[PDB]
Amino acid sequence: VENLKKPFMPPREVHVQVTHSMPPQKIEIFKSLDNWAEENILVHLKPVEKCWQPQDFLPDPASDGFDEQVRELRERAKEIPDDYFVVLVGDMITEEALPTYQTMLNTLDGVRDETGASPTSWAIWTRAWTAEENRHGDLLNKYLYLSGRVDMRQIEKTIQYLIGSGMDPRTENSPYLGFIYTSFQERATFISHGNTARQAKEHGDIKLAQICGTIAADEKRHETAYTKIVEKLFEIDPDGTVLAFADMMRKKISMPAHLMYDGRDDNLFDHFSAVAQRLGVYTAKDYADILEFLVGRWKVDKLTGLSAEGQKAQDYVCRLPPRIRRLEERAQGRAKEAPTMPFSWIFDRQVKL
Amino acid sequence: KPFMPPREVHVQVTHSMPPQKIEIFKSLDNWAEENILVHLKPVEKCWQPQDFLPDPASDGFDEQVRELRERAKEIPDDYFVVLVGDMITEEALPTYQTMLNTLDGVRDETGASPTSWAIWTRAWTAEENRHGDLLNKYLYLSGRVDMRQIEKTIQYLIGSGMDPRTENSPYLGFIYTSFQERATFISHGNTARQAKEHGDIKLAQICGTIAADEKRHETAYTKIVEKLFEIDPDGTVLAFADMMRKKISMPAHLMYDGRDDNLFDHFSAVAQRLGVYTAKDYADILEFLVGRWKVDKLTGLSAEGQKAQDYVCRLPPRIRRLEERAQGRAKEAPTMPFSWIFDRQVKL
Amino acid sequence: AKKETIDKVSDIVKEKLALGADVVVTADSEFSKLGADSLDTVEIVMNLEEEFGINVDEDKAQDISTIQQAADVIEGLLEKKA
Amino acid sequence: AKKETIDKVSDIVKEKLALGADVVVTADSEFSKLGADSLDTVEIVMNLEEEFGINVDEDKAQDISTIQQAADVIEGLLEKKA
Numbered sequence: 001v002e003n004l005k006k007p008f009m010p011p012r013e014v015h016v017q018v019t020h021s022m023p024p025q026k027i028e029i030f031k032s033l034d035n036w037a038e039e040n041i042l043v044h045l046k047p048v049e050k051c052w053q054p055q056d057f058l059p060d061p062a063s064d065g066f067d068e069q070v071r072e073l074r075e076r077a078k079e080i081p082d083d084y085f086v087v088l089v090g091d092m093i094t095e096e097a098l099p100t101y102q103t104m105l106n107t108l109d110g111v112r113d114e115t116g117a118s119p120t121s122w123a124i125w126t127r128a129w130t131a132e133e134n135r136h137g138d139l140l141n142k143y144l145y146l147s148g149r150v151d152m153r154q155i156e157k158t159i160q161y162l163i164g165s166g167m168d169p170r171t172e173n174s175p176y177l178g179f180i181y182t183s184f185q186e187r188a189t190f191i192s193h194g195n196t197a198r199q200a201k202e203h204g205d206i207k208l209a210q211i212c213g214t215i216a217a218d219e220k221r222h223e224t225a226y227t228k229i230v231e232k233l234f235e236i237d238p239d240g241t242v243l244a245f246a247d248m249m250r251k252k253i254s255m256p257a258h259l260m261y262d263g264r265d266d267n268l269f270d271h272f273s274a275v276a277q278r279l280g281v282y283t284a285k286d287y288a289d290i291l292e293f294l295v296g297r298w299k300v301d302k303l304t305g306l307s308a309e310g311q312k313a314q315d316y317v318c319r320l321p322p323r324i325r326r327l328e329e330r331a332q333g334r335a336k337e338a339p340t341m342p343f344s345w346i347f348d349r350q351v352k353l
Numbered sequence: 354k355p356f357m358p359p360r361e362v363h364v365q366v367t368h369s370m371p372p373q374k375i376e377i378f379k380s381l382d383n384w385a386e387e388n389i390l391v392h393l394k395p396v397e398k399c400w401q402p403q404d405f406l407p408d409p410a411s412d413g414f415d416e417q418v419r420e421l422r423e424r425a426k427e428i429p430d431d432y433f434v435v436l437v438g439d440m441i442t443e444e445a446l447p448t449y450q451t452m453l454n455t456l457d458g459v460r461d462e463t464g465a466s467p468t469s470w471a472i473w474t475r476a477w478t479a480e481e482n483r484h485g486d487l488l489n490k491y492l493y494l495s496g497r498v499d500m501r502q503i504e505k506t507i508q509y510l511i512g513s514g515m516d517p518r519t520e521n522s523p524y525l526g527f528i529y530t531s532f533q534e535r536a537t538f539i540s541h542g543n544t545a546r547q548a549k550e551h552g553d554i555k556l557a558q559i560c561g562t563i564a565a566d567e568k569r570h571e572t573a574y575t576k577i578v579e580k581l582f583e584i585d586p587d588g589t590v591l592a593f594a595d596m597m598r599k600k601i602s603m604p605a606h607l608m609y610d611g612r613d614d615n616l617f618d619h620f621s622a623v624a625q626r627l628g629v630y631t632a633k634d635y636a637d638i639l640e641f642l643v644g645r646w647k648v649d650k651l652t653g654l655s656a657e658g659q660k661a662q663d664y665v666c667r668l669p670p671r672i673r674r675l676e677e678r679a680q681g682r683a684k685e686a687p688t689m690p691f692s693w694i695f696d697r698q699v700k701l
Numbered sequence: 702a703k704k705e706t707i708d709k710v711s712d713i714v715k716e717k718l719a720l721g722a723d724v725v726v727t728a729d730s731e732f733s734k735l736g737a738d739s740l741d742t743v744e745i746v747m748n749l750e751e752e753f754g755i756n757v758d759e760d761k762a763q764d765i766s767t768i769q770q771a772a773d774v775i776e777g778l779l780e781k782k783a
Numbered sequence: 784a785k786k787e788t789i790d791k792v793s794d795i796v797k798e799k800l801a802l803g804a805d806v807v808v809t810a811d812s813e814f815s816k817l818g819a820d821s822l823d824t825v826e827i828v829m830n831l832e833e834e835f836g837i838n839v840d841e842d843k844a845q846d847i848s849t850i851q852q853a854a855d856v857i858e859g860l861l862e863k864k865a
């Protein structure tokens with residue numbers, strides 16, 4: 001109240017926050033499916049004992065070889081162009097804001113972890129999932145540190161700004177909206193890390209290619225389990241699910257790290273994205289293929305017996321992929337010469353947007 | 354299950370707070386902005402892990418790490434166990450935010466809720482993340498510890514979660530946190546003051562800095578609870594007593610490395626022995642609060658409100674005697690291997 | 702405003718906005734009036750570019766509120782090309 | 784089991800758990816039943832040791848069901864040093 005604009009302000013969400021859009025009756029659906037999740041969802045979790053750990057991919061600080069191991073890591077990192085590192089630091093920062101995602105999963109009405117150690121299949125999933133995601137953060141973090149190619153202080157400040165900021169995926173406490181969102185979101189990071197892996201490989205760092213390729217392996221596993229929940233919701237509530245699916249796409253999947261701030265760049269996310277767009281790490285063309293994949297995966301085209309505006313919603317979703325791809329192709333034609341810009345993550349060295 | 358973590362051993366209670374009282378917190382939204390959020394350090398003025406570690410961007414990096422490792426040689430393993438112990442606790446941060454968000458009146462409803470509580474929770478979580486990252490990178494660089502094992506122990510803990518038994522009551526929760534945050538203040542005060550004696554004044558700074566942060570958080574939590582005593586002197590006392598009967602179960606208490614079944618207890622025992630965090634401290638933490646909130650001076654409590662207040666006040670000296678006794682009858686401590694330090698052994 | 706551009710616009714507005722030939726259209730009907738989201742606004746111009754062999758620049762695209770305001774910008778770019 | 788042993792044990796449990804002499808305490812009466820938590824129980828034992836000048840290892844402190852069970856073990860510890 002009685003306010004102004006402060007000197008170092010992060011970007012806030014620019015829309016009225018909607019909560020509990022899902023009709024409270026439907027919470028039951030998820031209580032009934034508790035035993036189903038144990039059987040079909042939790043099996044997508046990799047038993048902790050068989051999991052990889054950051055240490056597996058980084059220099060071993062316990063052995064004599066440590067000094068050379070780091071030294072090589074740094075030498076191969078010399079050859080990686082800055083514009084790539086921007087996109088890498090971009091993932092590292094996204095990933096490191098993990099507390100938020102767990103926190104967001106725990107906003108979802110039917111599946112939220114009621115106590116922080118709730119023995120429900122959803123709370124078991126959420127916590128176990130969060131545990132697997134923490135490793136992405138830690139590993140990119142330590143690697144980005146050892147490289148010495150990036151201003152670690154600035155990156156860390158950017159993380160603090162992002163965890164403070166939070167995010168609103170506009171999932172409105174509806175597990176329909178949330179799990180559809182996550183289904184999508186988790187695939188984006190699959191395609192995202194697939195490319196970054198496949199690109200580091202070409203830049204001659206097959207150790208870093210493995211690093212990204214491994215995260216991708218994990219992300220597919222999560223993607224599987226999320227699409228699998230939502231598939232069930234189409235099978236049980238074909239109307240509500242479609243309507244929600246459509247609702248999400250209209251809002252557009254706002255990427256979880258979209259309120260990124262370093263205290264210097266006011267549209268830091270857009271600039272980061274633009275570079276990932278240009279490097280072909282995650283394009284608008286992909287956003288389409290991600291959407292289209294889901295429409296095939298969940299068989300949205302083959303759904304029967306929807307309501308009056310259930311059909312309107314279904315039709316909307318199916319024709320959306322080719323629609324974006326055209327609008328996309330157009331933008332590339334009319335697209336102006338990309339400017340060069342400094343990034344505080346790389347000591348203000350410049351890259352192309 | 355061949356590899357099972359320790360689960361919480363008590364029926365989970367939820368929403369013990371009467372739903373009417375959610376209002377109290379809505380009414381105090383604008384109060385929190387004025388008295389609580391000011392205990393947040395503006396992001397621009399905050400320290401960052403990088404400030405304390407070797408600068409990878411400069412030529413001096415090679416020597417910087419090399420010294421870090423040379424000073425780390427002199428630090429006895431039993432200390433490293435207690436250090437790794439903190440690092441693991443701190444790294445399980447997602448849980449604490451997730452727990453703060455279980456609290457009825459103050460939970461972040463959307464993940465970006467502009468309420469003073471959700472602003473606090475998120476901003477607080479952001480400051481805590483730095484503790485994790487910093488100890489993590491340092492424990493890595495030292496090369497004194499099996500980083501694979503530590504990381505596995507973290508996954509096991511974040512999977513496991515925790516139940517502080519706060520039952521979605523912000524009374525219970527903020528009292529818990531008030532307590533919990535001070536423990537880590539005394540905890541890191543000692544580890545800092547001890548590393549200083551072991552001749553690593555860079556690592557002493559590292560711990561002393563976390564302590565500076567923890568005090569600020571402790572200030573803001575005691576300050577909420579202070580308000581609840583001023584507004585609901587009965588409910589708050591009753592809750593305060595309720596917590597202490599349950600005993601503040603430390604957030605990292607379901608710790609598991611896939612080898613040690615009572616890993617937490619063994620870890621604690623070593624901190625107990627090193628005098629980093631003793632049973633005597635738990636007493637002084639409780640006693641501090643009883644003085645802070647003026648529980649002794651409260652007026653007009655109910656029939657079992659008084660029973661509750663009296664219980665809390667006499668609890669500190671009561672523990673300290675039970676404590677002193679245990680030390681006398683205490684048997685010779687055994688030696689034990691720790692997977693965090695490549696199974697090298699320390700005394701419990 | 703010649704009745705060969707107003708003719709060819711009608712067909713594209715109808716075929717895009719999923720309105721049957723029964724809904725009567727004049728040169729002053731707005732796009733918001735006829736029920737369309739923001740994405741359609743460009744998509745309608747998208748067709749006209751492929752159905753007239755001319756490209757309207759991103760700049761002069763947004764000024765459009767009705768059919769006349771649109772079918773007018775086609776007249777000009779066919780005059781300095783054809 | 785003997786009167787003088789039970790005497791001080793009855794008295795110590797009273798004085799600890801704040802009860803008047805009008806409150807009944809038999810040999811067979813239990814600890815939890817008289818309203819004691821696991822903490823009052825260890826404190827009661829700690830008083831006994833200071834009152835009798837002999838002490839109990841905690842590996843016999845869990846069998847403590849009743850005043851009888853507790854006054855029984857004191858008569859075996861005093862038949863050791865005395």
Ligand SMILES: C[As](C)(=O)[O-]
Pocket residue numbers: 094095098101133185186189256
């Ligand atoms: C933790 As994520 C947003 O990469 O699925």
Ligand SMILES: C[As](C)(=O)[O-]
Pocket residue numbers: 442443446449481484533534537604
């Ligand atoms: C985030 As903490 C366990 O240091 O209060």
Ligand SMILES: [Ca+2]
Pocket residue numbers: 096134137138
């Ligand atoms: Ca992390």
Ligand SMILES: [Ca+2]
Pocket residue numbers: 444482485486
């Ligand atoms: Ca961390």
Ligand SMILES: [Fe+3]
Pocket residue numbers: 095133136189
């Ligand atoms: Fe991830």
Ligand SMILES: [Fe+3]
Pocket residue numbers: 133186189219222
């Ligand atoms: Fe993920």
Ligand SMILES: [Fe+3]
Pocket residue numbers: 443481484537
């Ligand atoms: Fe902390």
Ligand SMILES: [Fe+3]
Pocket residue numbers: 481534537567570
């Ligand atoms: Fe803390």
